[PDB]
Amino acid sequence: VKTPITEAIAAADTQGRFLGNTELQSARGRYERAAASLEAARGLTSNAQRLIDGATQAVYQKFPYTTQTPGPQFAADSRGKSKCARDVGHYLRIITYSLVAGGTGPLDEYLIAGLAEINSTFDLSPSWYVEALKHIKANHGLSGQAANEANTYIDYAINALS
Amino acid sequence: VKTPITEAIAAADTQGRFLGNTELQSARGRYERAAASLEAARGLTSNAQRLIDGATQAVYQKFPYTTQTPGPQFAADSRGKSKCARDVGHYLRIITYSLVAGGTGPLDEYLIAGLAEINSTFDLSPSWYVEALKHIKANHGLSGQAANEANTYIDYAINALS
Amino acid sequence: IVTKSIVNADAEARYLSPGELDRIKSFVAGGQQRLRIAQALTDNRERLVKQAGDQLFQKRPDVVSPGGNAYGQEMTATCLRDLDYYLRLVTYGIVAGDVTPIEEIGVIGVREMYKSLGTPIEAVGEGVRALKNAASTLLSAEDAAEAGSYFDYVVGALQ
Amino acid sequence: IVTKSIVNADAEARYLSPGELDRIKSFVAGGQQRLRIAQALTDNRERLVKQAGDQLFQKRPDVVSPGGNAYGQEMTATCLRDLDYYLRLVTYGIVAGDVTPIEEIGVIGVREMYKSLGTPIEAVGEGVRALKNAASTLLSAEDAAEAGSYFDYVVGALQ
Amino acid sequence: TLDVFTKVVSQADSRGEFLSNEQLDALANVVKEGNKRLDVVNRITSNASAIVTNAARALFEEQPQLIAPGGNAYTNRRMAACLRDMEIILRYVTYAILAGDASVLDDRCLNGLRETYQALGTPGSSVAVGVQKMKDAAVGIANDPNGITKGDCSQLISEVASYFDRAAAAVG
Amino acid sequence: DLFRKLYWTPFYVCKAIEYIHRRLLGRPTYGRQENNKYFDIASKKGLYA
Amino acid sequence: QDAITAVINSADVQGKYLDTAALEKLKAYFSTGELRVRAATTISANAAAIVKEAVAKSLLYSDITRPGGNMYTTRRYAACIRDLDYYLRYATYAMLAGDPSILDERVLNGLKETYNSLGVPVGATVQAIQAIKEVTASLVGADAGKEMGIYLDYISSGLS
Amino acid sequence: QDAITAVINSADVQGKYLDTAALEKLKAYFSTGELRVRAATTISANAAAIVKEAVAKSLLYSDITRPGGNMYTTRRYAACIRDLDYYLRYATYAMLAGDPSILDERVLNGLKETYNSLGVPVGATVQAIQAIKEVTASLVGADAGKEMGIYLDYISSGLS
Amino acid sequence: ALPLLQYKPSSQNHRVTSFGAADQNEDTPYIYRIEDVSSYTDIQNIIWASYRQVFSEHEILKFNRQKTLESQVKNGSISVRDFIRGLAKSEAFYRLVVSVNNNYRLVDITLKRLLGRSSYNKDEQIAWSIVIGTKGFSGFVDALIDSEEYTKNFGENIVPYQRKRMEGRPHNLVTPRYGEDFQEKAGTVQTDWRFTLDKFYSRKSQEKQLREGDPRKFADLAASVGNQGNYAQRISAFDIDYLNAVPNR
Ligand SMILES: CCC1=C(C)/C(=C/C2=NC(=C\c3[nH]c(/C=C4\NC(=O)[C@H](C)[C@H]4CC)c(C)c3CCC(=O)O)/C(CCC(=O)O)=C2C)NC1=O
Ligand SMILES: CCC1=C(C)/C(=C/C2=NC(=C\c3[nH]c(/C=C4\NC(=O)[C@H](C)[C@H]4CC)c(C)c3CCC(=O)O)/C(CCC(=O)O)=C2C)NC1=O
Ligand SMILES: CCC1=C(C)/C(=C/C2=NC(=C\c3[nH]c(/C=C4\NC(=O)[C@H](C)[C@H]4CC)c(C)c3CCC(=O)O)/C(CCC(=O)O)=C2C)NC1=O
Ligand SMILES: CCC1=C(C)/C(=C/C2=NC(=C\c3[nH]c(/C=C4\NC(=O)[C@H](C)[C@H]4CC)c(C)c3CCC(=O)O)/C(CCC(=O)O)=C2C)NC1=O
Ligand SMILES: CCC1=C(C)/C(=C/C2=NC(=C\c3[nH]c(/C=C4\NC(=O)[C@H](C)[C@H]4CC)c(C)c3CCC(=O)O)/C(CCC(=O)O)=C2C)NC1=O
Ligand SMILES: CCC1=C(C)/C(=C/C2=NC(=C\c3[nH]c(/C=C4\NC(=O)[C@H](C)[C@H]4CC)c(C)c3CCC(=O)O)/C(CCC(=O)O)=C2C)NC1=O
Ligand SMILES: CCC1=C(C)/C(=C/C2=NC(=C\c3[nH]c(/C=C4\NC(=O)[C@H](C)[C@H]4CC)c(C)c3CCC(=O)O)/C(CCC(=O)O)=C2C)NC1=O
Ligand SMILES: CCC1=C(C)/C(=C/C2=NC(=C\c3[nH]c(/C=C4\NC(=O)[C@H](C)[C@H]4CC)c(C)c3CCC(=O)O)/C(CCC(=O)O)=C2C)NC1=O
Ligand SMILES: CCC1=C(C)/C(=C/C2=NC(=C\c3[nH]c(/C=C4\NC(=O)[C@H](C)[C@H]4CC)c(C)c3CCC(=O)O)/C(CCC(=O)O)=C2C)NC1=O
Structure with missing residues (x-):
């Protein structure tokens, strides 16, 4: 699965050669950023419960019909609101997973793989989840270069949504 | 040709996706070693003429028969010694080329590609060139982390020789 | 080795003489090499039992032969379990620095046990010799010397 | 340490242990430093004995009091000769590694002797403690730990 | 292909919780020791071809029937066959030290190795006598300090040698 | 060494003195008149005395 | 027993090999x-x-050395010095072994039986062992005086 | 007893008034x-x-909770939890008093007698108290975990 | 570098002629050809059925699809044989099959998907498993599509398909993308409780459940040791001639 340490391996393995300085150089780059990436993981893990209920009530604001229309897909029923905090709470897990991995791999393999297939069948509009993630990237309270770090992977999930 | 900036491209191009943060991690990492790699290029370029004639007379020491045996391949007369400083002087060019590129690409494409084919036909024993490169890696006078930097690519040419 | 000096000075009414304190300080210094040797013999146990069974059943085929004791899979598994026990006691003696906690568990009554089990003791001694040879191949020179020390004690004890 | 190891393996029916052979190897390895310590103590015989005896008479003025034993030039010369003898036995024990030369030359029957001579034991012991302090100040630091621990055996065995 | 970074994700996904702070303090030590890890890796690959023949000066000298007529390393293609994959041990052990976890090595290098080595007829146990001779030369190069800043990479040395011991266990 | 590691090392000093009287002399000690006598002897030279 | 022998025994009765916690214990020792x-x-x-300093601190000039006390007779004073020398010597053995099992096996086995048989006062013995502990913690330093006081307090606690 | 009460007692048995060293001890307390x-x-x-964390660290999934072990029966598991809760509670009391005398008076008095009477394994108890000490030193911090570990190691040393 | 060791080929269905064109059944696959364009429905079917062989239908998804190689196929710039190389040497296929499977099983899974035949014996899987190791995976996929069994049977411009499976299970169905030895590592048999019931009474759990001790723990070690002893001597005891058997001095 996609990781800068893995991407050095799978590039050098398909050539059948050893680890050159060009695969080794790539690993060195990852460490400088991995020091600031783990700063972004603790910023989201400690503020996790504020961010989930901060998000799942922000999507109810912009889409008030989602709590009103009687449908299996809709979150108007309590059972939907129980599956609301499950789904949005699944997003902050994988965002924090792809932070400490350094790559988009866990985001690519757990979350966005086959997302167009599932949202068409269950009629979950992807405009809902992109509205929650814009709330997360503006309200995590992170600062410095770590604020850039979470902001890529959130925005990477945004582009894969649309 | 093989470069950490190129290796980020050819990995992301064969997937048909954009540049993720995993391809973009390497570029940040590469600059930090590229700052110490260009230190190693000036250390070899300024001491270039001392290192070539330092090497081509060191190989004559360990192999004294190479100046004595009459053969087109051997360096008996002046024409071999003219082609001596050409060949060993070709090595310090490509070593300095692969220093500033950051990868083994120019070393992989100019020097070692098809080297087993040419040394069998012209009967040039590869034990000669590995003896010159051991003289270079011990007598370049480089220090610090830059001394590590030239020492990989010299030793990478050694392993491809044997 | 501390219990040895303590009961040694304890039979006497004198304290621990400071030459004994010097030997305890030197053992305390060498304890790190002892721990590395014991961990190296620890993690590679099944290789040592495999090569010991190899060299033993190549050396003495009568345990393989049906008149011998180690005939069949169950009896040969009990045989390699005995060799595993002796390797474990050798690691204990390597850590303790003196052969008391290995003789107390494996030596002090072994002849009558193996006599009333039917097995010959010389084959067990050859098995510990094979363990010593395999650990000599596994370790460095100064480590194989110090392991072959306690392996040598077991080989002398089983005879 | 060879004599003690041999008689200890003599009390048992078995040979010398691998542990004990490690002890002999470490004693051989430290033997050259012990010869250096013996070199320093041999060459500092005079001033060590005089400083220790005068430290004793500073601590204990009862011996050089006219009711005491070491009253007079000849008696105090024999006092300093006794301290010389004990420093010589300490050098022997530092070289040998055992305390059996210290013991069977100067420890084993000294209480009954100094009882019959009228000499107090504790002042001998305080003088050997002064020797320990003086030789500790002369030598290198953990080298002085080595010398002072044999001195410590002599001090604890005299009392 | 797993990592130290990705395996502490993968079990953390299976329990479905956020990553704890003492796991991040664990990974912070992994980043901290990363520079040391890189140095060890470059010395192995630069002496990669020098290890294999120096192991082949003893892999064949100790069991000399193997290259003598009859052994499975006898003819010349057969001899080049146990240099074409003596190095593949080094090709994947160096991948394991780079990733920091032996999961990459297990999937390709040793998954089917013990099955072919009785299908071909080669002695399987005669490999792991010389992979140990590689480990004796690999940790001798990785520990020696030549033109390098003084540092302590002892932990890597023991679990560098653990990858060779896993490489010898599944062949023998 | 076997007699020491069987009847002097695992037991109390007075218990070991009494048991050594049961073995060697073949009778229990009468009173205390023998008891911190052999225990006073044990305090200067040890088991061997 | 040792601390080494206790670690080996605790690893042995499970059939366990020497895991890393036992190696930590042995390396700390x-x-x-x-x-x-x-x-x-x-x-x-x-x-x-x-x-001498301990009896001068705790037991001397009390009623214990006066007539009627348990240390009045001179053989009883010599027995007192013998018992205190025993406590100090076996505490030295338990300090160097790093395991208090020899105190349990050789000193504290039948000692309350003896001290209640002879009429030996127990509290004065505890205070004498306390004075021993203070004197040797002053003499050896705090860092080894802690480990000396652990086994001397072990003797004092088992005596009570 | 307290640290205050111990200082007052040590000043009292001499007939001494409160000198400056005792005032230093009380002000440090x-x-x-x-x-x-x-x-x-x-x-x-x-x-x-x-x-719970201590038994999950040390005692669980061993042979002790397997049949044949001393924690196999469920009343014996409940007695194990009771004994560990006792050790933690009395270590809390000794930490707040600043004096280990209540451990000597209420816990460590006749405890080896009981544990050798019932056949309770002592080394597993020592390792369980060690796991208790590690868990509470992690939970409370290092600065108070030192003083908690002092009295828990006091219980462990007196038990052995 | 080194040439292929010679391996024995087992007799399978496709080594046989199967004469004629007008005679085979309906169930031979549609032999979709880029030369037949005539519409976009044929163009989209050629792309979709070329994904069918490579990703076994379920995966095609949206994300896995490389849109630029399909962008190219409509144009005709790259042949279908070149187009399968783009799908096979793609890291969306590497994470899906290549990392997950083994070098011995990868030879079996890529011959069914790129050449449309199962491997004959295990010796064929043994033979190519070396060519994977030194050249890399894309070096081996290059060697499969350059191979003359590919170009003779499929050609440059025909999507692959199972050749002559008259009475056989379909290859995307009989073979998953990972087998049973790898199943714990990619799958979730560890966390599903349905499988741990099967595991509980499994003979492998009884070897785990036993305490330290018993020779049944060393029973697997006892089979690997070998070295069985010689039988007793045939020669009769009576002749021995024991009185003259003793040597003096
Ligand atoms: C681990 C990563 C992961 C996520 C996040 C995920 C989400 C996910 N949410 C689903 C349904 C759902 N998702 C929601 C959530 C919402 N609908 C609303 O009305 C709200 C606007 C919104 C929450 C804020 C609801 C209510 C359902 C049930 C809809 C249905 O049953 O038709 C479904 C299809 C059915 C299911 O198994 O439950 C998936 C696959 N799956 C994954 O594997
Ligand atoms: C740009 C990188 C580069 C290098 C370095 C290179 C070397 C190279 N040296 C060659 C021959 C040669 N190389 C040498 C050099 C030597 N022989 C000796 O006796 C000495 C020991 C040694 C010099 C120290 C000589 C004398 C020849 C001519 C041999 C012949 O003609 O048979 C040849 C074959 C014929 C040729 O075109 O001249 C090549 C290709 N080619 C490359 O493209
Ligand atoms: C750690 C201290 C320790 C020792 C020494 C020990 C020995 C020991 N060896 C046994 C059996 C055995 N031991 C052997 C031994 C051998 N195979 C041979 O041919 C050789 C002579 C030798 C080993 C190479 C055999 C064959 C048996 C099974 C004999 C039987 O079933 O009667 C048994 C009875 C079965 C058992 O409960 O394991 C014990 C107790 N047990 C211990 O706990
Ligand atoms: C190698 C072992 C060894 C020892 C120890 C030893 C002692 C020794 N000390 C003696 C006298 C003496 N020893 C002392 C000793 C002392 N003055 C004090 O108050 C101090 C406590 C102490 C100094 C350490 C005195 C004052 C005399 C003279 C007593 C007399 O002449 O009656 C004598 C009798 C005269 C002589 O022959 O010198 C001997 C033999 N001899 C030995 O062979
Ligand atoms: C990537 C992991 C990987 C490994 C390690 C691997 C090994 C491997 N070694 C083989 C043969 C061989 N293996 C050896 C190696 C040896 N024989 C000896 O005599 C020596 C004792 C020993 C080397 C130390 C030789 C000489 C051959 C050729 C044998 C033959 O052609 O029959 C073969 C069968 C033919 C082949 O393609 O070359 C495989 C599959 N394959 C893999 O995919
Ligand atoms: C991928 C290309 C690359 C390499 C190769 C690399 C290596 C590398 N190793 C370093 C440090 C170091 N490397 C070592 C390694 C060791 N010391 C010993 O004595 C041990 C035997 C051995 C480990 C087994 C040590 C001890 C340091 C000290 C500095 C530090 O902790 O990083 C540093 C710190 C920065 C510097 O040296 O300028 C670099 C650059 N950095 C890179 O970007
Ligand atoms: C190694 C462990 C060990 C101990 C401690 C031990 C003690 C011990 N103390 C004894 C007597 C004694 N013990 C004491 C000691 C004391 N009475 C006091 O008032 C003080 C509080 C305390 C001294 C600090 C006295 C005064 C006697 C004399 C009783 C008598 O013999 O009449 C006796 C009776 C016989 C004899 O001394 O020789 C024994 C056996 N034996 C042992 O094996
Ligand atoms: C305040 C100080 C104090 C303690 C400690 C104490 C302990 C104590 N533990 C007991 C039993 C027990 N104690 C244990 C404890 C253990 N066994 C093990 O295997 C573990 C190593 C250890 C737990 C960590 C067990 C298992 C029993 C049950 C024996 C039985 O009742 O059958 C009993 C017998 C009666 C009863 O529990 O109700 C007492 C009195 N009493 C006290 O007043
Ligand atoms: C080179 C080695 C080799 C062989 C031998 C081989 C045989 C082979 N025989 C087949 C069928 C068949 N084979 C027979 C054969 C027979 N019917 C009879 O009554 C006779 C007893 C017998 C012939 C003497 C029949 C009737 C079929 C068709 C069966 C069916 O379609 O149901 C098929 C399936 C269709 C096809 O021909 O492609 C194969 C692959 N393949 C090989 O690669």
């Missing part, structure tokens, strides 16, 4: 053995001075 | 009482979690 040996040497230096 | 009280509060918070 091999770290502390330096000051263990140095403390045992300087306690073997002047044991008589320690016992 | 009055300085350390802040973190003493805060540590006692957060240990009283989650004692059951500490005992």
